[PDB]
Design an enzyme around this catalytic site. Structure first.
Site, short mmCIF file in Angstrom:
data_model
loop_
_atom_site.label_atom_id
_atom_site.label_comp_id
_atom_site.label_asym_id
_atom_site.label_seq_id
_atom_site.Cartn_x
_atom_site.Cartn_y
_atom_site.Cartn_z
N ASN A 84 -45.26 -20.48 23.55
CA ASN A 84 -45.39 -19.06 23.82
C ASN A 84 -44.40 -18.28 22.98
O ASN A 84 -43.19 -18.28 23.25
CB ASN A 84 -45.14 -18.80 25.30
CG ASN A 84 -45.32 -17.36 25.67
OD1 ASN A 84 -45.80 -16.54 24.85
ND2 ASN A 84 -44.97 -17.02 26.90
N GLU A 109 -43.36 -22.18 36.27
CA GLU A 109 -42.20 -21.49 35.71
C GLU A 109 -41.15 -21.34 36.78
O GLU A 109 -41.40 -20.69 37.80
CB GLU A 109 -42.59 -20.09 35.23
CG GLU A 109 -43.65 -20.04 34.16
CD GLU A 109 -43.86 -18.61 33.68
OE1 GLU A 109 -44.76 -17.95 34.20
OE2 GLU A 109 -43.07 -18.12 32.86
N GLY A 159 -32.13 -16.11 33.82
CA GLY A 159 -31.18 -15.00 33.81
C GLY A 159 -30.56 -14.72 35.17
O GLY A 159 -30.23 -13.57 35.50
#
Ligand SMILES: [Mg+2]
Ligand SMILES: [Mg+2]
Ligand SMILES: [Mg+2]
Lengths: 247, 246
Positions: free
Chosen positions: B9, B163, B169
């Protein structure tokens, strides 16, 4: 000088290579009249294809972009990519982005600032809904949208404002010339009061919302209407009629 | 057995020059016959990438909408993706869900439409940190998968990608054990809610951080069938990740 007539064709999410290629051949063969600027906005998958096939007299716009140059934004494109494909405009704040996809005024402002900083031209869209018009708050609605756009514009020479009343999009209910003129005159007055005379005098304010061959001449005759952002008719031969609205 | 699947991706990165350079290196790589490789360029470059890439690598769009044509400024349809020679679309990516607010309902409609137009679908699922910490990893990924499954007749053209958004983060880091834990539960979910045949045949690929250094350990997990690679997909080590089954 005097505001150059501007005709944009927003193909929206329509077309494939074969039928868009046939559309482009027809536009290529048309004579673009003097003092007229023509821009086509293909589906994002065809920006490159369309730029390659269209005559350079017609500019290419993207239908949307994001607000940074690269990043972790799966499904988005940046002004850098748009430029890289040979396109020189982007449409921002379109009614469908706002109302189908929920893009905020703040986000649209950030995109305008980034697109302009990157050297693209921006077609920035505003417009009220039927319920807003019926409540008598058209002016409040479009002035607020215009303000957020303006807060993010440092060079108006690269901006075109597009007024597309949402009730006129895809409905066949074209604004009358008087209705478009009324809003356009108010928007130009807003630019004069809030930015400058010069910006007010030079900025194209174009009308969108069921622009057709049958209605374009009377609309283009209005003193504060500087052209069109065309939807469904942009996919047909009658787009050339619209390009010639002042002839 | 399940054919190992490696997707790259590219997200919103690249221009014709540097993507053209990346493609040249991918064409030069030995792509093993036992591994299915797909690259997902930015939407402006689907056509460009398909024209430049060798047929041994398939092309995916990063998103699409749910009807074949219409008044949806800024969107593209499965028909356009196919018309550009791409054969896959990524749907439900964490960035679409969490940055751009795409609902499960919309993702399911996109899945049904894409499959109806003859595309393969890489359907992405995953839970955020607050969901993980509230103990609802399972509820979240199962409900996401249910919406997908409700819009899939023929699973032969679907790949599921997990995912671990909770590790993106947040200062958290997903171990191979944690990846396997979720993948094994997702296969169990398919077994109990769709069918054993679907559970055994459906690739479930890992969409967390993966590099050349970590890909072999991840690929060794019994319920990991490959990867949807993010940042490493723009780098030379992507060729190594392609070889991670072996
Ligand atoms: Mg608004
Ligand atoms: Mg009232
Ligand atoms: Mg004065």
């Amino acid at each position: 000088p005097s505001r150059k007539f501007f005709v944009g064709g927003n193909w929206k999410m329509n077309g494939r290579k074969k039928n868009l290629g046939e559309l482009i051949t027809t536009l290529n063969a048309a004579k673009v009249p003097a003092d007229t600027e023509v821009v086509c906005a293909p589906p994002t998958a065809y920006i490159d294809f369309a730029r390659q096939k269209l005559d350079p007299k017609i500019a290419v716009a993207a239908q949307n972009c994001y607000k940074v140059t690269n990043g972790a934004f799966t499904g988005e494109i940046s002004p850098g990519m748009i430029k890289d494909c040979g396109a020189t405009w982007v449409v921002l704040g379109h009614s469908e982005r706002r109302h189908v996809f929920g893009e905020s005024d703040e986000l649209i402002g950030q995109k305008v600032a980034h697109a302009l900083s990157e050297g693209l031209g921006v077609i920035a869209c505003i417009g009220e809904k039927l319920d807003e018009r019926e409540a008598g708050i058209t002016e409040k609605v479009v002035f607020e949208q215009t303000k957020v756009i303006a807060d993010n514009v440092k060079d108006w020479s690269k901006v075109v404002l597009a007024y597309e009343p949402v009730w006129a999009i895809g409905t066949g209910k074209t604004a009358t010339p008087q209705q478009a003129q009324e809003v356009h005159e108010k928007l130009r007055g807003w630019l004069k009061s809030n930015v400058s005379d010069a910006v007010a005098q030079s900025t194209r304010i174009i009308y969108g919302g069921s622009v057709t061959g049958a209605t374009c001449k009377e609309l283009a005759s209005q003193p504060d209407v500087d052209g069109f952002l065309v939807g469904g008719a942009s996919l047909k031969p009658e787009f050339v009629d619209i390009i010639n609205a002042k002839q």
